[PDB]
């Protein structure tokens, strides 16, 4: 059983003794610190609110467990047993906190307030930043969703140029990252963030998370197809690669099937096995059931270009209405090795330069999609901007001399539309002047209850590309 | 609840139709592919065995749930209901799998077998690689534990050179990574891996994981100290930083206390506030209860060196028996911003060149320690090396033409010590010739039971530095 009293940074256990005496309010906010990378997708807070913060999260047993752990961990009694007991007794263990947030799926530039946190009881001034640690982990679904959407922008640009439309876009970047993330929980969170933008995934854990915490009208939010791995090819023995291919495509004769083709020599597999020995099993397939050839090694760009040149000389190629080469509809390629946002851009640009339509290719990405990301990418940060001490509110901030980029915002914050329709964050309570219309943040959590929520279908609509 | 039938890569759902007919055994192994590092710490498999693989993991409801999800996810009935129901009925839902592994905490060069997996019932040839995805996530605790031990080696070298001993080494690298990892589950796994090498942590989640899955004779495996954050300084107001510092060191007058000092001007704080205004509260403190000044911004090397120069001109400095400068015992520094293995090395080398002992400094590291790591760092990989088809064993492997570094090992594997005391992995069942002493792999899981377990104390002993 998760215990929120044990789900903070150790030093926060000692902070209730450090704030100014007679502090009744601590007010804090989360942002992606401003370096015009540009526009982030806000996603993932609703998971945290429901799984970890709502309802009766304090019990007498959890207080005693934490007391006993911290006594040994600090070799001292610093733990605030009385403060936690107050929440248990006064509010039946429900947190006296209010969180306001931008709607999930919203696409918003860096440097803006995304959510704010404050205590609703003066006795609980210390609780606001107790829960910093758990809320800051929202950096991860934000960053996965944002980086996935930035890859969708690249794919959309090159698909539109080379084909004239966006058909199939939502299946062009497939999540391969289940083995390459750091835990089962991370797999579900990260896969769900990718599914904000795309529909193809092998990280099954994302499906149940979406169903439980967000919801979709469709039975499931993402889809897959049968596909080989090296064990199912190499198990046949090195002299029997053709037999493995023949068996697999015949077992999956009326659905799309991906077949990894590089166990021994990708180029021989394409030109001689697929292109000659088994060609009669490929040209017979349906447009709804292509063979998808999967290289999985070598320089990603060089390998894709050579595979395409090989297949173009063994299969009938057409020229689409934009002038780009197109494999027949029963044959496609997926590159799933070494894919991240940089190599994805390299490959589609290299294909365009060689006059190959992006219709021909799809991508799989594991670590690059779900693991090779840190809180530094969008520079996600949670800071106190306002306190009330001795009944007087003061605007507070940090401004380190050697790094102006760690300067934080001052006072009570609100998010507004500008006259040109862009976003602005107002500081120092200036939203109250109503010169910029109403605050766009909404109360999503108050006093142990989730007060506003979004379906996964809503989030996908909010996160759409402009195109 | 967790459902192992939904905890695999989607394509593995389809692999039972792809292996050669008449296959009764699939045998697979895990390694860190050869060389770039040398030596890895094997850690974290026992967590996975106990949390996810042992006991009754198949039920009628879980089979039906997976059947329903996969029907929608694939738009097709491909799920192996018969094969999963076989495990349910014959084995009461216990997995007929045997896993053999090197003892946890063992320090092993790259390119060696670390564990193997095989099915114990011919009907379950498909189950070996079903569980690849969950087992390969062991890359994360292995990589955290290894990267943390490599930092410990750097610290030990420089501490020995500048002071003559290793006193305090185990508290020199403190885990700050709770907010910077991707999930609660990752936090506990990663923090527990760092504690293989060190004893200081703020990532509380690691403590409960170790207690539940490994065990220590001590009450807790890691420890912390009171410390400020920017909210507990800046809440006092920009003009009252000195009041915040004075309150905090007085509240924690008899334990070590870390006080972040860079809210507005780290160099003013050190020279004028600590070095003059509050100096009388510092020079009175015990050797067991120093003030630890914490910069948190700017260039990490330049900032540490300038802080040390400032403090050495305001406080009495000694020269130790190695010739290096030493602050008084009541005053220390912790650098917890921008710390990874590369900047840690930069800082201790820069200190040595300026004749400062590493006794003066400690480090905190969050993302660099627990999040900025991928499966590519040690190149962790799980592959099939042996199968039995029509009662004949065959040695199988991949060997892609464009990347010899993706070549996998052949046949039945074993791990041995060499005559010179190093390690060798024997292939093709050659361990059976018994020219090389006992196999170092031990059965840790068989038919749903954990058969061999290690305490956290044993793991720490196995992972000790040579020195
Ligand atoms: N359906 C699939 O083909 C599938 C699914 C999951 C992982 N994979 C593997 O994932 C690897 C890529 O992972 P990384 O992006 O983490 O390096 C590929 O080499 C690929 O073989 C493939
Ligand atoms: N006890 C502490 O001082 C403590 C604990 C946890 C995090 N932190 C913060 O962790 C940050 C470092 O995080 P990253 O290494 O992920 O960038 C520091 O800037 C530091 O303020 C400090
Ligand atoms: Mg692969
Ligand atoms: Mg790989
Ligand atoms: Mg900081
Ligand atoms: Mg930071």
UniProtKB/Swiss-Prot annotation, chains A, B:
Expressed in large amounts in bone marrow, liver tissue, and muscle. Also present in heart, placenta, lung, and kidney tissues. InterPro entries: Aldolase_TIM (IPR013785), DUF5598 (IPR041529), N/Namide_PRibTrfase (IPR041525), Nicotinamide_PRibTrfase (IPR016471), Nicotinate_pribotase-like_C (IPR036068). GO terms for cellular component: cell junction; cytosol; extracellular exosome; nuclear speck. Diphosphate binds at residues 179, 230, 294. Catalyzes the condensation of nicotinamide with 5-phosphoribosyl-1-pyrophosphate to yield nicotinamide mononucleotide, an intermediate in the biosynthesis of NAD. It is the rate limiting component in the mammalian NAD biosynthesis pathway. The secreted form behaves both as a cytokine with immunomodulating properties and an adipokine with anti-diabetic properties, it has no enzymatic activity, partly because of lack of activation by ATP, which has a low level in extracellular space and plasma. Plays a role in the modulation of circadian clock function. Homodimer. This is Nicotinamide phosphoribosyltransferase. The gene is NAMPT.
């Amino acid at each position: 059983e998760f215990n929120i009293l044990l789900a903070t940074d150790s030093y926060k256990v000692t902070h209730y003794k450090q704030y100014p005496p007679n502090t009744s309010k601590v007010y804090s906010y989360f942002e992606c610190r401003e370096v015009k990378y540009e526009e982030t997708v806000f996603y993932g807070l609703q998971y945290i609110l429901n799984k970890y913060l709502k309802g009766k999260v304090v019990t007498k047993e959890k207080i005693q467990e934490a007391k006993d752990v911290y006594k040994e961990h600090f070799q001292d009694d610093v733990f605030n047993e009385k403060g936690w007991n107050y929440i248990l007794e006064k509010y039946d263990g429900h947190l006296p906190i209010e969180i306001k947030a931008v709607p999930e799926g919203f696409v918003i530039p860096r440097g803006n307030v995304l959510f704010t946190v404050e205590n609703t009881d003066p006795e609980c001034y210390w609780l606001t930043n107790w829960i910093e640690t758990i809320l800051v982990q929202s950096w991860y679904p934000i960053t996965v969703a944002t980086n996935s959407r930035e890859q969708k922008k690249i794919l959309a640009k090159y698909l539109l140029e080379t084909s004239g439309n966006l058909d199939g876009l939502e299946y062009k970047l497939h999540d391969f990252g289940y083995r390459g993330v750091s835990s089962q929980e991370t797999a579900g969170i990260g896969a769900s963030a990718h599914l904000v933008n795309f529909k193809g995934t092998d990280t099954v854990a994302g499906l149940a998370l979406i169903k439980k915490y967000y919801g979709t009208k469709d039975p499931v939010p993402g889809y897959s197809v049968p596909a080989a791995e090296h064990s199912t090819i190499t198990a046949w023995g090195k002299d029997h690669e053709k037999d493995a291919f023949e068996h697999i495509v015949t077992q999956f004769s009326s659905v799309p099937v991906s077949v990894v083709s590089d166990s021994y020599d990708i180029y021989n597999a394409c030109e001689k096995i697929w292109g000659e020995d088994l060609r009669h099993l490929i040209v017979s397939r349906s447009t709804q059931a292509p063979l998808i050839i999967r290289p999985d090694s070598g320089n990603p760009l060089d390998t894709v270009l050579k595979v395409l040149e090989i297949l173009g000389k063994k299969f009938p190629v057409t020229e689409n209405s934009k002038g780009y080469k197109l494999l027949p509809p029963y044959l496609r390629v997926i590159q799933g090795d070494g894919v991240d946002i940089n190599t994805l851009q390299e490959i589609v640009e290299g294909m365009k330069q060689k006059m190959w339509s992006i219709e021909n290719i799809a991508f799989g990405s594991g670590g690059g999609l779900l693991q090779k990301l840190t809180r530094d990418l969008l520079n996600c940060s949670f800071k106190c901007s306002y306190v009330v001490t001795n009944g007087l509110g003061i605007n507070v901030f940090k401004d380190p001399v050697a790094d102006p980029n760690k300067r934080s915002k001052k006072g009570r914050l609100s998010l507004h539309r500008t006259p040109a329709g862009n976003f602005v964050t107002l500081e120092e309570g200036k939203g109250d002047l109503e010169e910029y219309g109403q605050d766009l943040l909404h109360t999503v959590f108050k006093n142990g209850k989730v007060t506003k929520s979004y379906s996964f279908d809503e989030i996908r609509k909010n996160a759409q590309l402009n195109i």
